[model samples]
Structures are given as C-alpha cells and as structure tokens.
Target: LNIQGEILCGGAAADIAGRDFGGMNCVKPLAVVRPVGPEDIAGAVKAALRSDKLTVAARGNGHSINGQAMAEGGLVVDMSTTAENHFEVGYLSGGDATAFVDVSGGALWEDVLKRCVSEYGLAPRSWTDYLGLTVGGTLSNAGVSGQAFRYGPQTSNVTELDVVTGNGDVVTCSEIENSELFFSVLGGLGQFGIITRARVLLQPAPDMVRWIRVVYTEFDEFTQDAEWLVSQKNESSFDYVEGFVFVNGADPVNGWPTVPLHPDHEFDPTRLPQSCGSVLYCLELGLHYRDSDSNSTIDKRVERLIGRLRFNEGLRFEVDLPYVDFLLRVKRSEEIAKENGTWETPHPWLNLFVSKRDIGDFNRTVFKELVKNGVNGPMLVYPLLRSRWDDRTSVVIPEEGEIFYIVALLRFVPPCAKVSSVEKMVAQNQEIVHWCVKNGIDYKLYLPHYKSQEEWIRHFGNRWSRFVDRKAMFDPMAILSPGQKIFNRSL
Candidate 1:
C-alpha cells in the first residue's frame, strides 16, 4: 500500500473508533486508518472497494448516538488526524465582500471559534449548542442551536465543500457548482461522500452577549412568544432564542434550579401562578452587543422585547458575558459532569423536529403528563423557522408548517438499578416514538437511528428514491457508512 498514514489492524485506535458518545452500541472495526490528508482517505476508500466484504466509514470524533460512523468489522477512517489540514480565510470580491473560512471537516468548532475570533474578529453564522463537535459531524446532521432560527443550520451556512465520494473521487461542490452532490452531501448522513474541507460563512463577532431567561407556566403562551420572536427581523429580535421544559419541583438538574443564570439568582416557586402545573417552561434568550454599545441601550431593547412576552414576572434572570463565553456555556456543564464521572455515562438522547400545528398536543401529553417529574437532564424544546432550511438538502422535517420545534431529551446518567436502567431509557424513547406515530403527529427524528431499510424508506418518504439514486451514482456498491444500516453493501 502507498498510504502515508498508519493503518492499524487491531489496537487501542481501532477499539476507540468502535465506540461513540452514545455509550450504547460498540462494534469493533477490523482496521482503523489515521489518514494524513484527503489523498490517504481516497486511497483507503479505493482499497476497501478492492475487497468484496470491505466498506469505508469516516468517523468524526465518534459522537454518533447509534454507531452511524462505525463500519462494524470493515475499515474505519479517523478523520481527526487531518484536523489541522486547512484553516484559510477567504473573501469573495463583489458588491460587498463576503467573508468565509475554508476549514478542515475534522476540526472542532471550539477551536474554530477561538482562532477565528482571536485572529480575524469573525465567527461562523450558526452553531450547535455544544462546541466540541466536529465540523463534518454536525453539518452532516444539520447542526441546530439557538441561532439556527435566524441563520439556519450549519449545513446551510457553508458555501462549498471538498468531498471524497464513495466512488473514490475527489469533488468540490456548492449551490451552483456540482449542485446535486452539494445538496445531497449537506445533510446526507455520510452516505454520499466524506467531507474533507468546508467553506463556512462568517460574520463580525460580537464582543458580549446579554443572556436572559424567563419562566412560563402555560404551553400556549410559551409557543406563541417563541414563534413570534423567531419570526421577527434580526435587528429587532434577540440574537439567540431557545426554550426548555423543567419540572416544577426542586430537582437540581431538571427543575427550577436550572432556570437561574447566576449564583445570586434564585427561582422562587411561590412567584408561580396558583394554577401552574407539575411542569414549567423557560424561554432562554440572548442579545449580542459590542464593547462600545451602552448597557442601557441593550437593556432598553431587551426590555422592549421581553415586555412583549407573557412569562412570569419574578422568574426572570439575566447575566452578561463575553460572546465566546456564552457560546461555550455547555462546555462548563460538560466539565462538571466529567468531574462527577457522569460524562462517560450513557446518553440516550432523543431529538425530534415537530410541526407547530401539533406542538400544543405534544405539550399536553409528552411534557405535562409523560415526563412531568423529570428526565434527569435538560429537556430542550425550542422553535425553529422552517424557511431557514433549504428544501433541496437531504434533511426531512415536519411537512405541515413554516415553523417547527426541535425537542431534545438529553439524558446524562448511568444505568442504575430498576429506577434508571439503559433499557428503560431506550424504551422510553421508543414509547415516545410509538406515541407520536400512533397519534399521527407530524414530526421527524433528527440524528435519526433505524435498524431496517423499510423504516429508513418510511423516514425518508418521497426522498428515498433520490437518496437511492444518489447512492447508485456515487457509491454504487453501498460501501460507505454501513453503520447507518440504510443500505447493505453489495458483494
């Protein structure tokens, strides 16, 4: 073999590649290759094609919940080895110079945030809540966070990509250039190609953020305010908008304590309405400002915005921090979890995009009754504008509305006795899905996981044929991303 990188048959590298952040499924790959660059990756894919039972899987930090990035007993390509391959700032000369950064897919967003803001005073338009994820990993799944309402998912913010197709070809794609490959690979779940490089859109980074949170007792008021805020213009609306469900009781991780932003801030249950239910909601908001901007000016704007909402008055909390600090807020929680040894525990996280038409019904059943007590972690429920998403991409969402909610049940706990077992958590996820299906709620699973082709076809709906055609035109043999279980490798 003429490969420049190390190819280990069985060792610590291969063992690590077999596992993911989900902490559930672990399938040891026959071999794991640490590629030096795209050339080595293409060579690995070509070599896999030479073998009858071999397949290639591009793993980006192994954050997948269902082993979507694993190759079982086949070959695994460690994308992180090429993390430092690219980091160039480019400007397109036009009416107004549009700025972008050409970064390696293997690079983490946290590093990108630091370098971009420190060197160029710029940052990407959108991001996932957790910054530790790889560029390719989140882009492949349509990265969503509070800012996604305005800028769309991470996939939509990228202008171009350098992909290594399943057919062992290096291709550069964009909206107007190789458009089919571009659209397919954006939210393609790594079925069409492996992203080596991406041209992400950038904007001037803000100096500080006014982070705010307010409590709401009624689901209707919560959804109404969230949807209205998301629909407003960027100048008038909060720069970031997100909401979550919390129990009314005093569970540190999942209740009133989670609403407080500062050490001095306290969540007083007596301030709540007399008719408040077992569960409550909090609208998390952030307004960005420059160092030169006055606090009074930002406060006035924030007041004007918050005055329009109907959240409980005394339950509001506000804090100010650096823009980068606000973005990396999740990292602090992760560090605390790591210290407590809960970071390594099973994360039976379930994320879904549900239509606005049925969100009230969802709140009635799922939030108020099914999980009124607590899920042991944050139950994030926020609205996202469907118009922010591109229809041409491979991602599927609720078809009924211009607005939908991204509900994420992020459970971070180990398997205990009968109280909280992994099987029970997984079963709860299944029960939620079953309930959604039985009730005919218009929803689609994000970071989807399914075991059979039939279920995949049902998930994709009308897009299944196009996906299959893309696979035939690119991989042909389905020799890539076998861990997704969407298509079987042809012998």
Candidate 2:
C-alpha cells in the first residue's frame, strides 16, 4: 500500500472499488490509488508488482459494462481523478500539416470536446455517442460512433501515448517509436499496459449540425442506403451516419416516439408502405456547417444527400442544432432517464461487430424475435468501414469483407424490476452469441468478457499469440487488469 499517489482503504476504498456504471458486479479492492502523474502511477504499480498476488486495474470513469476496470482484492487506480491539463496543439514528429492535441488519458471526451472546440475551433475526428466516457477508457476499447466511418475509431486517431506498463515503467510509444507497445495498448482491453496520456489527432470543427433521422420499413432498403451513405466521399456524404432498430408500433423506450428530435415533429406510421413489420430501422444522419451558412444552402446540401436514399417519404424527422449540442444529445436523454429512475439501473449490455453477410439473419432473429418487444433502452445498429481501423491494434473484427455493423443492445433494469427479467435478458444475450457461434457467423464481441483462458484464446482468434507475447514482454508478472478475467496473477 506504499506509493507516492494518494491511497485509500476501508470505507473510501470500498466506494469506488465496487462501483461502476453497469451495476452488474461488485468487487472490493484492498486499495484505491488516485495518481496525478506517471510518477505516482509508476510508484503504485511498482508497489502492486512487488506482491506476488497483487493485481492492478485503471478505473476510468467506471463506465465499463463488464468488470474490466475493477480489481478484486487487488489495487485499483482511480484514473478518473488523474486529469492533467495536457492541452497542446502541435504537429507529429514528421512536421505534417495535420495536427494533434495532447490529452490526458483520464480526461472525459466532453471536456476534451468543449475545450478543444471552444479554444481552438478544432476537435477530435472520432467520437462515441456518449461524451462522459474517458479518453483512456475508450481508446483501450475503441471509441466508436457515426464519425468512425470516415476518421476511424479513437484508437486510429491517437498518434502517441504515455503508458505505464504492468511493470510499473512509464514509456512513450507511437507508430514510429516503441511501435510494438503502441499498437498493443490501443484497443488492447487493459491487457498490455495502462494508458496515462494520449496524443489525439485533431481537425477543424464545424459550428452547427443538421441532424436528421429517416425511417425505413424494409431491412433490404435500410442496409442498401446505409452502405451507400458510408461508401461515398466525405465531401459529398453526411458527416455522421448511424442507424438503430426500433419496435414498430409503440413502447415507452424503443417506440416511434423516440424517432423525432423536435416536439413539433410527428411520426406518421400510415406513410410507411404496407410491407412493414414488427421492427423498423431509422437511419440517423448529420451534416456539419458553419454559422455563416444560410438555411437555403443547408437545405440544398441536406436534400442532395438524402435525396439519393429511399426512406419512407412522410416519415422523416430532423432538427437543426449546434455542433456541441448535437454531440451532447445523449446527455439530455440521461437527464430524462434519471428523472424516470432508469438512470441508475443495472445495465446488461451487449455489443458486437457483425459482418454484412450475416446481418439479415441477425435482423431476423435478434431484433425481429429475440427482442420483439422494446429493449427499454437504446438499440444501436450502425455500419463502419474495416479499412478505417488498424489490424495492427488489438481490436478484432469479422473475417469477411470491408463493411460491418456495430450492434449494441443496451438494456437497463430498474431496482424494482424482477431479477428473473434481468436473468432472461442475460440468457437472451448468451443465446445470440451462441447462435452466432453455432452458425459460424463472422462476428466479434466488442468489450468482450470471457471466463476462461480457452475462451480468451478463441476471442482473440489468430492474434492470440501476439497478445500473449505482449503480456510476456510488457506485463510478464501478469499483475495488471485481472478484472478482465483473462490471465491470472502469478506468485
């Protein structure tokens, strides 16, 4: 428990050690360390490494659905409080025109967005739908959203990182420097090293966004239009593209009421063709613009983009909002959900990357039948480009072509909800994964959780060797991130 960083025990340690946004698992750590810089991180990590059975994990904002950030009877570094005002805008070592911003790994994306956009009129190229997630947290997994189609995930956008490895040694790594450690930690799932700070790529920020959502009754047409939208050149295409599956008629959460962005807007079900079914898709799109732009110009640009696509003619919904507001849209929903008492509920979420080839089967089974009723939360299904991601990084995807979709089933159960109901949803998620495996569908679990070494091997696929070698090189003692349940802390 000896370290330069501030350490907590007993009651103070109990609070954070067992708390995470998921509300799924409860783990009590022996100590909680809030390190301000690499020196403190190194000291704490070195202290943990000295104990043959002491494992450590970085708890960033405690947003993990699984216990990825928890340490059971071990050391948990509360990286959320380790924010450093490491704001510097400069070019990479090659002296290129494209610039980057040095951001603390513990910094929340919302703070990063506000400071970067307001101060420099610039922003990170990629994003997640929610802004409260930490930079290190998402980069360790893969910060993905609509913008990922063009700019790639947040992992792709980071040029370099100052990471404290499992050995309690601080190392700066990038593509050209310590290339092995650089790629390994990105989307590495807290395995090889703990990211302390990162250099995130930046670009000019737009002032406003014309956010639009159009409904589609047919899955074929939905896929076709979504694929076409992501394939087009950035100059001509929408800046942000994402889609979601909703229960056709009405439910409190995933119903037609969720489609409209404005109170004035209405959902006209009769406008949909007679071919509609139990579930429908909504293609969410956004185009960025400057304040200097006129309404007519914006209208012309938007129409020209969605004009090529085929959505239910009368079922379109849109709202003109500031770029910052559009990015922070989910925060508003959080406020509403909090009022509804669903905000603090336990979330049993599942995320996956499914290939386009098997998406129809997925839609037919998962959305159409498994979750025919509302998920009582968000159901995000959106396409992303494989070429946009780096295979060198630890993030794995389908074995097939360039196009894949990220399907997330976010289900929240209130404290009053039946424990059986939660168990059913968990079983349903298991059924979906097993069905995919049984049918040999090309898919990979995002933010994956497995209980055994064999399952871990299967999850990594062919890259398992590289992952193990990385543990041998950077975390030979296997004293980091035991909450992942992949490796054991050795004596």
Candidate 3:
C-alpha cells in the first residue's frame, strides 16, 4: 500500500486499534496511519478509496465508548501527528472585536485554553467539562459544558472548518462558504469527513471565578432555579451553570457532601428538613470578575441572581478560584482518579438529552430508582437551552420542547473486577435506554449508537434524508468512518 504519511502495521497497528475509553468491543485494524498534515490526511483517504474493499476510521484520543473510531481490520488514522500543524491566532476579515484561533482538529482543549489565554487573554466561549478531549473529538460530539448555556455547545462557537471529505478532497467551509459542509461536520459524528482544522470563535477571558453551590431537596425546585439562571441574560445570571443529582446519604463521591466548593464548607444535614428525599440536587454556579472589582459588589451580584431562585434557604456554599482553576477542575480530578486506580478502568458512560417536560418522570424512574445505588461516577443532570444550538447541525435532540437536560451516567468499572463487570455495566446502560423507550421518554442519546438502520433513522428523525444525501455526495463509496456502521461497508 502507498501512502504519504507514516503507517504502522502488524503488532504496532494491533496495539492501538480495538482500544477505546469503553473496553467493551475489541476490533483490530489492518494498520494505523499518522497523518503529518492536512494534505497527508487527504492523501490517506484517497489511498484507501483506491482499494476495492477498504475503510478508514479517524482515531482522535480513542475517547469514544462505542468503538466509533475502530475500523475492524481496515485503515485507522492516528490524528496525533497533526496536533502541532495549526496557525496562531488570527482575526476575521474586516477585523472587529471578533477573533479566532485556528488549531489542528487533533489539538486538545487544554492546550487550546493555555495558548489562547496566555497569548491573547481570550478563549473559546464554550467548552466540555474535561479538557483532555481533542478539538475534533468534542466537535464531532457537540461538546457541552457549564458555559454552553450562554454560548451554546462547542459546535456553535466555531466559525469555520477544514475537512478532508470521503473523496479525499480538501475543502474549507463556514456559514456562508460551503455552508453545508460546515454545518454537517459540527456534531456530524465523523460521518461525512475528517476534520483537519477549525477556526474557533473567541471571547475575552474572565480573570477570576466565584464558584458556588446551592442545595435543593426537591428536583422541581432545582430544575426551576437552573432554568431561571440559564434563561437570564448578561449579568443577570451566573457566568457558568451546571448541576448534578446526588444521593442524600453520605456517599462521598455522589452525595450531599460532594456539593461543597471547599472542604471547610460543611453539609448541614439539619438544614435539609424532613421533606428531603433519598436524593438531592446542587445548582453549581460560577460568577466571573476582574481583580480590580470589589468583593462586596461581586457578592451582591451573586446574591441578586440567587435571590430569584427557590433553592433551600441557608444552604448557600461558595469559594473563590482563579478562572483557569475553575475550568481545569476536572484535570485535578483526573489526576486523583489516576492515583486511586480508577482512571484506568473501563468507563461505561451514558449521555442523553431529555425534554424538559419528560425530565421529571425520567428522574423519578431512572435517577431515583435504577441508579439509586450509584453508577460509580457523578450523575450530571443539567438543563440546557435548545435554542442555543443550530438546527442545521447534524446533532439531534428531543423534539418536545425548547428546553432539555443532559443526563450523563459516568460509570467506571471496578479495577479488580473481572471483564464481566464491564460487560454488566454496558448491559445495564442498554437496559436504561430500553426502559426509556418503553416508558415513552422523549429523549435522544448524545453520543448515540443504534443496532440497525431503523433505530438510526429514528435517531436522526427528519434529518436522516439530509444526512444520507450528504454522505452520498461527500463519501459516495462509504469508505469513511465505517466504524459508525450507518451503512454497509464499501466493497
């Protein structure tokens, strides 16, 4: 086989393929290609197309849970080589305050954060909670975080992208130029093309963060306060908003005690009152300010926002942190999890976007019952504005309302357990999804996967025709991303 970039085969190729964040499915590939640049990526795709029966899957950090990056004995492109292949910050034509940073799709969000802030005092408006994910990785999945409520997901914050289409052509796209490709690649789940570079829109970075948490005994009140804060504009609401469901009892990682910002802040069980149930909610918030700002004024601003909410009184808890610290908090947790030996375990995660109306029933049946014992990780149940997202993007959401909640069950297999433990966790994830369908929950899986074309068609809903047509135009032979298994592999 002839290729422009570096390619590995035999033992070397076997080692990297079939491995992902989720260790449930193992499918070894024929080889691994590390494209040196955008041209090289395009070259590899062209070379693969020449073969009668060949498929190519782009592996970005191997973070997918559904073997979405696996090729099962075809070509696997390792995008790490292009991580350093992007240009520095550049302004748009007729430059106004609007700015952008063009980076390799393989670039991690953490590096993007450091370079953007240190060099320009600016950063992307939206982010995923964890910074270890790659730009292409998150963009493909509709990266979500606390800041998304204000800026939409990472998909919404990018202005342009350079994709290597299935036909091995290099193309640049945006809202006005090649608009279809631009919209398709964002949250397109790597189906149409390989993202080589992206120009992410930016905003001035906040200097410091006032991170706070408020408790609620009732789910209704928790959601009420969350929706209110996200719906507010400018300074009327917190700069960032996120929340989680925790066991009311003292489970260290998933309970009331975990809601506090600092260790010194105690969970006063007495304040909960008798009406508190087996579970509770914590409205996590962040307010940003410059060093020159007065603490009292910032405090007042926070109080004004919280006062409109209906959370339990006397349950306010807070701590001030550097803005960078607040954003990178998950990195610290990663290190600790690594230290505790939990970082290496298989992560059987489940992410869903349920309509605001159906969320209550979902919480009661899923969060309140099935996972009442705990998923061995945090259960993120946060509200998001559906209007923030673009309708043209390939990502799908529940249809019932303009408001929804992203419920993530992040479970890690016990380190000492046999492989069966991981299988069981994966099985349980399936059961949860099945139950949601059986109960008529109006929801859509975020990093979605399905057993057949029927389920996939339903997942895309009305967008199915558009998605398929794009595939036909860009990747007619279906040689790209056969790991998605949306269509039969090319032959």
Q: Which ranges in model 3 have alpha carbons more than 4 Å from their true place? A: 1-5, 92-97
Please state every model's RMSD to the true fold in angstroms. 1.5, 1.5, 1.8
Best by lDDT: 1
Total backbone clashes of candidate 3, pairs 3 or more residues apart or in separate chains: 0
Cα lDDT of model 3 by residue, 1-491, tens digit: 44566677877566767788776678887888878877777877887788777788888888888888888777888887789889568766644336788888989889889988887888888899998889998998899999888888999988889999888889999999988988888898888889889998877788999888888888888898788788887656788898788888887666776677777878888888797768888888888899899989988888887778777777778889898889999976687578767678888899999899899998888888888867766789889999888999888989888789988997866678888888888888899888988888888999887869999998888889999998888888887878877876766
For model 2, name the residue pairs that clash: none
TM-score versus the correct structure, for each prediction = 0.97, 0.97, 0.96
lDDT of 1 by residue, 1-491 (tens): 36777788777777788788878987987888888888888987898888878898999877788999999778888898888999999876743326889999889999999999999988897999998889998888899999889989899899899999999898899988888999988888999889999999888888999999999888888889999999997668799999799999998878898788888979989898889899989999999889898888878888988889999888999999999899999977787678766688878888898899977778889888887776777889999999989989988888788999999888777444343477788998899888998998888899999997888988898888999898898888888898888898987
Q: How accurate is candidate 3 locally (lDDT)?
A: 0.84
lDDT winner between candidates 1 and 2: 1
Report, for every candidate in turn, its global Cα lDDT versus the true structure.
0.87, 0.86, 0.84
- Measured on C-alpha atoms, candidate 2 has an lDDT of 0.86
